[PDB]
Nucleic acid binder design. Structure first.
Ligand code: AMP
Length: 71
DNA sequence: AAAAACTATGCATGCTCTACTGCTTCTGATCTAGTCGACC
């Protein structure tokens, strides 16, 4: 049921296969753990005249985008 | 005095080292084109 979330949190098939072996017995909690790669958070296309509607009408942070490698 | 036996020698064969020169083939170094992995 929650294989995708655990895989994203841990980024390893072996751990997902081993921990989530039984179908009924799941994991109570799943979150980023030490020495376990996690999927980075990306950004979607930005509407140029709906920013406020996208921000729910609150102050927002703007920062110059950097051309490098995400790590 | 005359005939037969032993030794000197000497020229030619084949082998052996020793080297030299040429061709064929294997190994190694270098250059160039193509390919894979990671990202964005
Ligand atoms: O085009 P894209 O979706 O790959 O761009 C988003 C990625 O770029 C990273 N990024 C670049 N610059 C920044 C800043 N200033 N802050 C946060 N992330 C940034 C994103 O993390 C993403 O991988």
């Amino acid at each position: 049921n929650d294989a995708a979330e655990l895989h994203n949190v841990t980024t390893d098939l072996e751990k997902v296969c081993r921990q989530l072996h039984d179908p009924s017995v799941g994991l109570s909690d799943i979150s980023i753990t030490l020495f376990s790669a996690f999927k980075p958070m990306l950004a979607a296309i930005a509407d140029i005249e709906h920013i406020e509607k996208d921000m729910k009408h609150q102050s927002f942070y703007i920062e110059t985008k950097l051309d490098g490698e995400r790590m």
